[PDB]
Design a protein around this nucleic acid. Structure first.
Ligand code: NA
Lengths: 154, 83, 260, 95, 184
RNA sequence: GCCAAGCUAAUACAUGAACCAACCGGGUGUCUCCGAGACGCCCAGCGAAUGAAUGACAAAACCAAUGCCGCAGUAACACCCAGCAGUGUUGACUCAAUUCAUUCCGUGCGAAAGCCGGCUU
């Protein structure tokens, strides 16, 4: 007669049970390896390059299989910065990079821009116009190759 | 019989050529085990186990060095703490 | 896939004339990289001048008359490289492959009890089956039980004749190194301070014997001794001392004037 | 050399009582059984001279269940005795 | 044949790419397995590099583990009860990864009595380690309720069309309650 | 471009080596002492699939059981081994590697059941 946990109706509306692969949440005697403040079992990872782990990653409840902090996605390659351009998708944003291009013949500059598709973890809530830091990862979709690592307000 | 020689029972064919001594042709025996090859087979198993024995000795030396280094730190800590 | 090598595409460290032929011998995979190796056919024929052509160079090699690291090699495409010992017992000459101050390959004469050891840089460490530690060196060797204090970047003194490691040199502040790549190849310096940039390359600052200051990537340095006084390996004549081109041009003009 | 105490193996504390070991082996000055080894005992002899090990029962007489082994421990009594008052001076250092 | 390249796709701008190279062997695909319940039948496939893949066509046996007790047993599959992709896979009775199946509960009941001495052991004898490990140990009612029924729900954890095996794990906790609500 | 019958090689194909020969672990039956020990039995190789752990941290009283002389010494460990791993790497890992359970092996794994010389084995 062991009373287990209950289904979290907030985060279970996807026709299949959302669960973290790295850990088993049905353990009667959890160890000290992966335990958050609430005493639950949650897998969290420490990425490199001196990036702090968000609080919602350590003591949250969301399930993301493409998050760089709570999944097997690793960060390697390039680190860039941009401004949020659109947040009309689900866990995806568009960032824009603006720069000046120098034309040698006329000795003058030229305004140019480029658009990138980035995966936004639920640990972050960026608004349009904010500045973000993104890091390169493996192909996560047809167009996505970067992951959000930090957000600067306004 | 299992011990009787077989080199003397091989079939020999005779070829005659005009103005030449007749020659006898016999097949070369295959799968014939000689005391030269019996020592060759048994030799292989000798250094197969010898090589494995050597690696176990190399493992023991490493564990001695690891443990002895770990032991010296305990004595140094206790020597200073007691004295 | 590829099997040939055009002469123009061959590395410039070798001395091959563009007007002599279309092709150059392509080294086989082995201990050293293709772009940082000297094939055995080039050493025998183009440097030692023992073989006039490549037909006579095959007679010498396929007889096993050339020993590399105390082992005969009969392939003219064998990739011999840095810190390698080449011995020909019939002629009684022993060499070591090093870099001169300019950057070219140099053959340094050796003696007995010195042609028995070589220095290897550790590039990787991992755990094998049965929980044994294995270290991979810069020339493909795999040591199955290294010193417990070994780390990546250190130098291991090996004994080719008897096949066990004898000593270990650690990589840190206050040590003698030789640069093996870049624009400062073959220069012997002294580690001053190393900048650590995670994810990117590390930069090491070195000072020469004369006091000249220079920098290079951390992967291009090779520890060879505690300091410039007691080196563990014989170096070429210039001792890794780079000189100005202005003065260099003057002495050769004077020496050649009095040469006759 | 030095002959004060002997080492007894492999007697087991959970199987043999205090009186049972005293019967086979005579320890006059001191006697103690060690549990971390669980096969070690330290008994001191008043007048061992050549000790009980050299005369006999070295490695052949065997004890109940297992063969017995003994040797010269090269430890005397008055050293560990002396440290006790040195340890008694700290037993009273704090109340 | 089948390809896995992006040359036939539209650009993000909606335009069309002009392909000027033929199809390469390095980007091929293969037809699926469509594994089903039944007597064992597999076929090997030679993959790139000379390796082999076991394309299973029918299976009826697998290895299922009780995570709470850290044990495992070889049992027989009884039915397919749920599939997240489409219930037409439940009708056709196909076996894929993460599908929900019902397995034989007899071997797990026997191990339960042999270990913890509970029957849902002719002579007690000196073996009384039952009380030694029965302390601080409880079994959820949901697992025990279906153990005595004869079958227990499980989740397939292996890819049958890539390795030729149907291995799984028994549902417990919140995952069990999630699927029991949909099935009703 | 082809068919049938009759001969016979292998480093082609197939099958297959017990004792010499160790260290260590898990589960279980009959004996002795008062929980300890002995014995018998099943399984314990490289690689593969699944599940569970490891893959670090960064001021005193009371009770039950324990180590040492009553709490001062104090790597750990119920004998043969009293230091025979308490310590993998990276910027970062669900990676390397180790232990337990089931299938393994139902894709695989010969000492080529191999060939030459020199000394007398
Ligand atoms: Na063969």
């Amino acid at each position: 007669y062991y009373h287990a946990h209950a289904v979290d109706a907030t985060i279970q509306h996807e026709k299949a049970y959302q669960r973290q692969t790295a850990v088993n949440e049905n353990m009667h005697r959890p160890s000290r390896k992966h335990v958050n403040k609430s005493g639950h079992i949650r897998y969290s990872k420490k990425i490199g390059l001196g990036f702090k782990t968000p609080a919602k990653a350590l003591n949250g409840k969301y399930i993301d299989r493409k998050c760089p902090f709570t999944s097997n996605v690793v960060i390697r390659g390039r680190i860039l910065r941009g401004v949020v351009h659109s947040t009309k998708m689900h866990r995806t944003i568009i960032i824009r990079r603006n720069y000046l291009h120098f034309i040698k013949k006329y000795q003058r500059y030229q305004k140019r821009h480029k658009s990138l598709a980035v995966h936004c973890s639920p640990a972050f809530d960026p608004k349009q116009g904010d500045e973000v830091v993104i890091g390169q990862c493996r192909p996560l979709s047809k167009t996505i190759r970067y992951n959000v690592l930090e957000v600067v307000s306004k | 019989s299992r011990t009787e020689d077989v080199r003397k029972y091989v079939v020999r064919r005779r070829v005659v050529k005009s103005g030449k001594k007749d020659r006898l042709k016999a097949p070369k025996i295959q799968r014939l085990i000689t005391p030269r090859v019996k020592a060759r087979r048994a030799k292989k198993a000798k250094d197969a186990i010898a090589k494995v024995r050597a690696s176990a000795a190399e493992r023991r030396e490493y564990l001695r060095l690891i443990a002895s280094n770990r032991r010296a730190l305990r004595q140094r800590d206790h020597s200073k703490k007691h004295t | 896939a590829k099997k040939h090598l055009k002469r123009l595409y061959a590395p410039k460290d070798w001395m091959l004339s563009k007007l002599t032929g279309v092709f150059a011998p392509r080294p086989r995979p082995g201990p050293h990289k293709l772009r940082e190796c000297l094939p055995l056919l080039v050493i025998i024929r183009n440097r030692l001048k023992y073989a006039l052509n490549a037909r006579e160079g095959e007679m010498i090699l396929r007889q096993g008359l050339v020993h590399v690291d105390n082992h005969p090699r009969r392939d003219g495409k064998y990739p011999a490289g840095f810190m390698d010992v080449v011995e020909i017992p019939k002629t009684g000459d022993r060499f070591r492959l090093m870099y001169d101050v300019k950057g070219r390959f140099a053959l340094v004469n050796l003696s007995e009890a010195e042609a028995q050891i070589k220095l290897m840089k550790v590039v990787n460490l991992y755990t094998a089956t049965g929980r044994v530690p294995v270290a991979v060196t810069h020339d493909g060797h795999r040591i199955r039980y290294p010193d417990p204090h070994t780390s990546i970047g250190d130098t291991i003194v090996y004994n080719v004749k008897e096949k066990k490691c004898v000593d270990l040199i650690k990589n840190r502040q206050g040590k003698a190194v030789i640069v093996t790549g870049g624009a400062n190849r073959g220069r012997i310096g002294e580690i001053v301070k190393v900048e650590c940039h995670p994810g990117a390359f590390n930069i090491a600052h070195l000072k020469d014997a004369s006091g000249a200051e220079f920098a290079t990537r951390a992967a291009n340095i090779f520890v060879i001794g505690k300091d410039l006084n007691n080196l563990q390996v014989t170096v070429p004549k210039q001792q890794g001392l780079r000189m100005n081109v202005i003065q260099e041009r003057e002495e050769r003009l004077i020496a050649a004037e009095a040469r006759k | 050399e030095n002959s004060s105490c002997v080492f007894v193996s492999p007697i087991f504390r959970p199987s043999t009582t205090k009186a049972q070991v005293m019967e086979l082996f005579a320890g006059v000055k001191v006697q103690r059984l060690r549990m971390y080894r669980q096969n070690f005992a330290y008994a001191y002899l008043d007048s061992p001279a050549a000790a009980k090990k050299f005369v006999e029962e070295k490695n052949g007489t065997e004890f109940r269940g297992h063969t017995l082994r003994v040797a010269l421990s090269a430890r005397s009594l008055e050293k560990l005795r002396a440290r006790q008052e040195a340890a008694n001076v700290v037993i009273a250092a704090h109340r | 044949g089948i390809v896995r390249s992006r040359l036939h796709k539209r650009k993000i701008t909606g335009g069309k790419t002009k392909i000027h190279r033929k199809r390469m062997k390095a980007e091929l695909g293969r037809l699926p397995a469509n594994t089903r319940l039944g007597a064992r039948r597999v076929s090997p496939v030679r993959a790139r590099g000379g390796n082999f893949k076991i394309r299973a066509l029918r299976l009826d046996t697998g290895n299922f583990a009780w995570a709470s007790e850290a044990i495992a047993h070889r049992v027989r599959l009884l039915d397919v009860v749920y599939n997240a992709t489409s219930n037409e896979l439940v009708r056709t009775k196909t076996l894929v990864k993460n599908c929900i199946v019902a397995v034989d509960a007899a071997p797990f009941k026997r191990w339960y009595a042999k270990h913890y001495g509970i029957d849902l052991k002719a002579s007690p004898k000196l073996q009384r380690e039952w009380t030694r490990r029965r302390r601080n140990h409880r079994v959820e009612k949901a697992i025990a309720d279906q153990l005595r029924e004869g079958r227990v729900l499980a989740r397939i954890t292996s890819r049958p069309g890539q390795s030729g095996r149907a291995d799984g794990i028994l549902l417990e906790g919140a995952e069990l309650q999630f699927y029991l609500k949909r099935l009703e």
